[PDB]
Design a protein around this ligand. Sequence first.
Ligand SMILES: COc1ccc2ccc(C(=N)N)cc2c1-c1cnn(S(C)(=O)=O)c1
Ligand code: NA
Length: 246
Amino acid sequence: IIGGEFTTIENQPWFAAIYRRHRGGSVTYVCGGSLISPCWVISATHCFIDYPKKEDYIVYLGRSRLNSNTQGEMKFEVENLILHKDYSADTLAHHNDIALLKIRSKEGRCAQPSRTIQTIALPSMYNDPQFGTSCEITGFGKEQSTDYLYPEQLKMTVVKLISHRECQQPHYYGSEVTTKMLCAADPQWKTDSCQGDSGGPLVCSLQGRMTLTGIVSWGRGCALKDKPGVYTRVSHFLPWIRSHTK
Ligand SMILES: COc1ccc2ccc(C(=N)N)cc2c1-c1cnn(S(C)(=O)=O)c1
Ligand code: NA
């Protein structure tokens, strides 16, 4: 996250921290995710497509720091890694960038809701917030495009939704951004998601309810003029989510 502010997991209790175990024992941060039910985490397929082996991944809930065992956190293994069958990546645009992770503790149990571990509601079909709506993003991603390290403390920021017709303008993304994607940015281009924030949530308050409207997917640079953050529009994928969580 470029700009914005540091936060803790009690502010974003649906946030999942996803890590990968390498040969030799080293563990590195991969992507963010969101808890949509006790046994299920939703993320982005591009996070796992090059290493699609479920045994490689570690999922944490109730974790606020990149290398601290936050009080009340829960550690899980991936029982089932579900990638979208028609996923593909162009020079910029990522298609069907959505994945599901069935989580299980070493004792065989799913998440236990608490003050730091909570689910996030899914949107209803054909009901996305109007363009201009302010929404929040969360992640352990880069603070600056030139950084190579991720921040130790979890971050958050607020961006505004951008219409499909504006996002399709020639100086924006043209025909590369589709109706299955949602654009969001800062009007002053000072804050945004970046590398490391992928798979994480775009949460919008819609008709009084906190909703998982988007999943961090792609963008040209980070906080670059006329180049919004692009997110998987979760409302389009409700039939796919329901079928694969059964
Ligand atoms: C693999 O990098 C990624 C990966 C995912 C991204 C998701 C969203 C955005 C965004 N602008 N909201 C940027 C991203 C970049 C990304 C795009 N450019 N850069 S950088 C660090 O400037 O080279 C990082
Ligand atoms: Na840390």
